[PDB]
Structure 1
Amino acid sequence: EQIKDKLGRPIRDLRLSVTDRCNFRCDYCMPKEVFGDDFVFLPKNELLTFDEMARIAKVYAELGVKKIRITGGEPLMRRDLDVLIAKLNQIDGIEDIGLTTNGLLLKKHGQKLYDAGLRRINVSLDAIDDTLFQSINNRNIKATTILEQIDYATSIGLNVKVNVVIQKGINDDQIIPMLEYFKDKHIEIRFIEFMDVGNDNGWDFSKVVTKDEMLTMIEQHFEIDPVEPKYFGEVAKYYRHKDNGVQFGLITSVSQSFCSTCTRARLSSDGKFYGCLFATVDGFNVKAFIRSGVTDEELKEQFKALWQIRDDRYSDERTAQTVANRQ
């Protein structure tokens, strides 16, 4: 029931990638140069079905999983996503189901999602200036559009948090406007440090605004009290606006790596297992495993086996290398 990996970390979260498609082409994720006109995405049948996803989640739930986060791609591009949600909403032990999206399709699908049980979403928005944000998504989408979508999602009863990845030299200046806009809207926003491994290969701080620097900027425009961790392994450092009372987080993904508390399992859109967001090599083929015909007991012992040999710790590895890189 509680299974731990080789670093003593229990399994708690399941990340389900639902598609390899996206409606954006953001330079650090799906740059046009690689996913341009030529690129073949997965054939529809090479994706896991909703039934398969639900059966996988049922079994991980028996091994201690309690949260599932839906990702892609842009998840909202996957047709009938609401059916997935309904089926995950029927699984004992799963207490939270989240989704992250760029939000463009929230007016089109939000209600169906909500109807099937979706209550929380994370929206990725890397800027609030329209011209900057188009330079980031590369698909001519205005930030104003996404603001509108966020307000729709809110209006229908979704709780919305925003995630912002900051790259020094690109969206530095988005921090204060975005803090402001979402303080107004009583919405929790979170600024994430950019992860970029140089040639050495430790962390490339060239760009890279750390939590510490970000904080220096913030405190000059807003008056703030830190907010004590709700629980023990909690990733984001939170701070409160004295006003008001509205929270925002800072995610020290590079300056202060958190592999020691990382309880996350991942299934990719092509149905393979990964024990870390980074991975150069193909994972165990869960998809082909279950398609060969297997019992639930068989699946469960395989997921258990996969977690018990997990020792991923990519960021810590980059931190140790970075330190070693001071010869």
Structure 2
Amino acid sequence: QIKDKLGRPIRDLRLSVTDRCNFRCDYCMPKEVFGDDFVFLPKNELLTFDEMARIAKVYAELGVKKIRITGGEPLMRRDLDVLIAKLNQIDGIEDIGLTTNGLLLKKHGQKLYDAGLRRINVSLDAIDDTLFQSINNRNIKATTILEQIDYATSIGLNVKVNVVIQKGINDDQIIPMLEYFKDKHIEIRFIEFMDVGNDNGWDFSKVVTKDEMLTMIEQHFEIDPVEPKYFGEVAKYYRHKDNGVQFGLITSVSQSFCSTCTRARLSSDGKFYGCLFATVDGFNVKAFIRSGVTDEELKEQFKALWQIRDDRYSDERTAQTVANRQ
């Protein structure tokens, strides 16, 4: 079994398929920085689907059961159905997932289910049209996205929602969001907002802890804990007593998870990272695969890359706060 320096297997491949997006959320792609000026990667510098297939295959032979398609907005990638179809004919890969803001689901959703997509996570940082429009900067109403989700549901897709909660900004949205997806039978998850200050420590200001979210919810709903599907399961799950619908609370900052992190990522221009955090550029997979290589030689470079992985960034920020508190 292939394992990093901390003893973790490879089980997940996060696959970035584009640097582009039809939103300008300010945590993520603020307009100052990603303006009309901006030059996103030209066509021929993204990986072809057939290179993504070769990489996903070789990864499946080293452990990866699961693939997550991101960007960017992944739906901004043209002919995404083709990738989903290619990846879904690889036999070690059990589940394929796609993280979207959802806007393009009515346009491309059917061609993607046809191709083998059964499951999507829709980000949606707010349900009130005014606040959400002021988060996304592209004049798109939370209502629009609540209708793409319902069409995704209707074509047969399994939909889950990712909400990043921020104190002053995204706080008052927890309760109307729960109550909405409760009669919609969709599984919603509220994620702690992540942020690091000057002193390498955590930024607990805008962060509303799993402790604090539940104290709020348990006042407006009757709530039951659900024992973890598997062991080392990221999100914590609870259930509503009347209709047994579930919601999740991911504890990013107040409860780090680096020890069971099994996720390898490829960025939109074909670089390897062992962590959603990275100061330096990583191995240039693209320059490697285009210099001519054998599958079973691609297999050794990824394996060499994983075995030398020792990433633990949310752990380090955790170890720095204890160091700063001193």
TM-score, length of structure 2 as denominator length: 0.99
- CA displacement, residues 232-264 of structure 1 (integer Å, 9 cap, x when unaligned): 110000001101000000000000000000000
Secondary structure (helix, strand or coil) at the match of 1:294 reads coil
- CA displacement, residues 188-227 of structure 1 (integer Å, 9 cap, x when unaligned): 0000000000111110001100100011101000110100
Q: Give % identity.
A: 100
Q: How many angstroms does 1:154 deviate by? A: 0.2
Q: How many angstroms does 1:319 deviate by? A: 0.6
Q: How many angstroms does 1:325 deviate by? A: 1.0
Q: How many angstroms does 1:37 deviate by? A: 1.4
- Cα distance in structure 1, aligned partners of 2:152 and 2:254: 33
Secondary structure (helix, strand or coil) at the match of 1:170 reads helix
Q: How many angstroms does 1:323 deviate by? A: 1.2
Number of aligned pairs? 326
- Cα distance in structure 1, aligned partners of 2:281 and 2:91: 30
Structure 2 residue ranges without an equivalent (≥5): none
What does residue 139 of structure 2 align with?
A: 140
Secondary structure (helix, strand or coil) at the match of 1:163 reads strand
Q: How many angstroms does 1:297 deviate by? A: 1.3
What does residue 33 of structure 1 align with?
A: 32
Runs (4+) of structure 1 moved beyond 4 Å? Answer: none
Secondary structure (helix, strand or coil) at the match of 1:169 reads helix
Structure 1 residue ranges without an equivalent (≥5): none
- Cα distance in structure 2, aligned partners of 1:297 and 1:159: 35
Residues 1:83 and 2:82 are matched in the alignment: yes
What does residue 107 of structure 1 align with?
A: 106
- CA displacement, residues 61-105 of structure 1 (integer Å, 9 cap, x when unaligned): 000100000001000010000000000010011000000000000
- Cα distance in structure 2, aligned partners of 1:299 and 1:315: 29
For the aligned residue pairs, the C-alpha RMSD in angstroms reads 0.5
- Cα distance in structure 2, aligned partners of 1:148 and 1:131: 17
Q: How many angstroms does 1:51 deviate by? A: 0.2
Q: How many angstroms does 1:324 deviate by? A: 1.1
What does residue 280 of structure 2 align with?
A: 281
What does residue 173 of structure 1 align with?
A: 172
- Cα distance in structure 1, aligned partners of 2:96 and 2:2: 21
Secondary structure (helix, strand or coil) at the match of 1:69 reads strand
What does residue 203 of structure 2 align with?
A: 204
Secondary structure (helix, strand or coil) at the match of 2:167 reads coil
- Cα distance in structure 1, aligned partners of 2:323 and 2:221: 37
- Cα distance in structure 1, aligned partners of 2:52 and 2:245: 36
- Cα distance in structure 2, aligned partners of 1:183 and 1:200: 41
- CA displacement, residues 254-301 of structure 1 (integer Å, 9 cap, x when unaligned): 000000000000000000000000111100000100000000111000
- CA displacement, residues 91-126 of structure 1 (integer Å, 9 cap, x when unaligned): 011000000000000000000000000000000000
Secondary structure (helix, strand or coil) at the match of 1:257 reads coil
Secondary structure (helix, strand or coil) at the match of 2:325 reads coil
- CA displacement, residues 27-54 of structure 1 (integer Å, 9 cap, x when unaligned): 0000011101111100110000000000
- Cα distance in structure 2, aligned partners of 1:242 and 1:323: 39
What does residue 293 of structure 1 align with?
A: 292
- Cα distance in structure 2, aligned partners of 1:238 and 1:297: 40
- Cα distance in structure 1, aligned partners of 2:193 and 2:213: 12
- Cα distance in structure 1, aligned partners of 2:232 and 2:303: 22
Q: How many angstroms does 1:15 deviate by? A: 0.4
Secondary structure (helix, strand or coil) at the match of 2:168 reads coil
- Cα distance in structure 1, aligned partners of 2:242 and 2:100: 30
- Cα distance in structure 2, aligned partners of 1:215 and 1:102: 25
Secondary structure (helix, strand or coil) at the match of 1:123 reads strand
Secondary structure (helix, strand or coil) at the match of 2:276 reads coil
